Amino acid sequence: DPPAVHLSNGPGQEPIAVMTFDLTKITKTSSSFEVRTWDPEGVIFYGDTNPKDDWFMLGLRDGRPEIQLHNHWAQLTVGAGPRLDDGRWHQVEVKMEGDSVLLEVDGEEVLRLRQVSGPLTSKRHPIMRIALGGLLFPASNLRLPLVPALDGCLRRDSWLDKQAEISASAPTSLRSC
Amino acid sequence: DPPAVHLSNGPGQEPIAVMTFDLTKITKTSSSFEVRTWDPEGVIFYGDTNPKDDWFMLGLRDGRPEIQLHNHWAQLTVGAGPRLDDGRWHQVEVKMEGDSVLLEVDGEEVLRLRQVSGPLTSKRHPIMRIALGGLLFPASNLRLPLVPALDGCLRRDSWLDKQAEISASAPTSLRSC
Numbered sequence: 001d002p003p004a005v006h007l008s009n010g011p012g013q014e015p016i017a018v019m020t021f022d023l024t025k026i027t028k029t030s031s032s033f034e035v036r037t038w039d040p041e042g043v044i045f046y047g048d049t050n051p052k053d054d055w056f057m058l059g060l061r062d063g064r065p066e067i068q069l070h071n072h073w074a075q076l077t078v079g080a081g082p083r084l085d086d087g088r089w090h091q092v093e094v095k096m097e098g099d100s101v102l103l104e105v106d107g108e109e110v111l112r113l114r115q116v117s118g119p120l121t122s123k124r125h126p127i128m129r130i131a132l133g134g135l136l137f138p139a140s141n142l143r144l145p146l147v148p149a150l151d152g153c154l155r156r157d158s159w160l161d162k163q164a165e166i167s168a169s170a171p172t173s174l175r176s177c
Numbered sequence: 178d179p180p181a182v183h184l185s186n187g188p189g190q191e192p193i194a195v196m197t198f199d200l201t202k203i204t205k206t207s208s209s210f211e212v213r214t215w216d217p218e219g220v221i222f223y224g225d226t227n228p229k230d231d232w233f234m235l236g237l238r239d240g241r242p243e244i245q246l247h248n249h250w251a252q253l254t255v256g257a258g259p260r261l262d263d264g265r266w267h268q269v270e271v272k273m274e275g276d277s278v279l280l281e282v283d284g285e286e287v288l289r290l291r292q293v294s295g296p297l298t299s300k301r302h303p304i305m306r307i308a309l310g311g312l313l314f315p316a317s318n319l320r321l322p323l324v325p326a327l328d329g330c331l332r333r334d335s336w337l338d339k340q341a342e343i344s345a346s347a348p349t350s351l352r353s354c
């Protein structure tokens with residue numbers, strides 16, 4: 001695994017890494033990574049501009065991707081795609097195209113959430129945070145709670161536009177797989 | 178094709194068949210059929226209790242399933258699953274399990290819409306209409322318009338609970354494939 005990190009360190013409460021982005025600079029509105037796990041439930045990543053009313057989470061529930069999103073346009077809890085909890089490395093891409101959010105798993109589009117978002121460079125609070133392996137609000141506050149810690153590995157990740165990233169923080173040291 | 182019917186007769190404005198169901202009798206809250214088409218866009222079926230604010234549509238957009246749903250709990254436009262416009266027969270099942278609506282394509286769950294519905298036998302207007310191959314309101318009134326007529330075939334269909342069906346109507350004669 002090209003430098004692979006564990007998505008949760010121990011209890012799986014908080015994220016392993018939080019990155020902050022300036023939306024006025026953002027061009028690339030997509031993210032991509034490889035994930036490996038035997039765990040059927042947990043958070044893969046979370047993103048927000050506001051943890052009360054403009055947020056997004058991607059995780060697994062019953063082995064399969066689940067997206068939760070709450071913003072001015074849309075509030076939803078959706079599962080889609082094949083199980084990913086077979087301990088093999090899977091390529092995932094989450095992209096915003098027009099007003100849609102698309103999820104691709106192993107080269108195939110498995111979900112398209114249409115009419116869920118107005119442009120990034122036009123939007124309100126112009127800072128976006130991306131949290132890897134945990135949420136930035138309690139799990140009990142999701143639309144549909146899940147147990148946050150995902151026991152899996154993450155590698156070959158790229159988050160939004162690196163030229164728009166303002167800062168990156170880890171709350172502890174990141175362990176390798 | 179065990180008695181297969183065309184999903185649109187000519188212009189594709191109106192449905193080929195409309196069935197009406199008594200929700201106080203409903204037990205089976207699922208529907209299933211096989212579909213065949215080369216057409217990448219159109220309506221497969223529509224259902225409602227109220228065409229202003231409690232309705233559902235399943236069709237194809239860009240070859241792939243798309244669900245549109247508008248009710249008291251949820252308003253959404255979602256694409257998911259593989260392309261079905263390869264002129265092969267595909268098995269589709271749409272089921273309500275708890276508060277979710279699940280779509281299965283060729284034996285695989287490809288979409289789970291969670292937290293979208295309160296029970297049927299508990300719900301408001303206790304008549305549900307299911308329209309095959311068209312809508313019961315203009316297409317321009319969908320959340321996201323599509324051209325309604327789907328040029329495909331439908332066979333081996335079963336809609337909700339036949340012991341709860343109150344009446345069935347066709348606006349013209351149904352043609353075979």
Ligand SMILES: C[C@]12CCC(=O)C[C@@H]1CC[C@@H]1[C@@H]2CC[C@]2(C)[C@@H](O)CC[C@@H]12
Pocket residue numbers: 029030031046047048049054055056069070071094095096101117159160
């Ligand atoms: C999925 C996106 C866009 C695609 C991506 O790379 C990740 C990122 C996660 C945060 C989401 C964002 C789309 C727009 C959302 C949903 C905002 O409304 C609030 C959080 C944002």
Ligand SMILES: C[C@]12CCC(=O)C[C@@H]1CC[C@@H]1[C@@H]2CC[C@]2(C)[C@@H](O)CC[C@@H]12
Pocket residue numbers: 206207208223224225226231232233246247248271272273278294336337
């Ligand atoms: C998908 C369901 C439930 C499953 C099925 O067999 C078809 C049917 C189509 C009408 C939908 C219904 C679920 C509940 C909905 C979405 C109601 O709120 C209004 C229309 C109903």
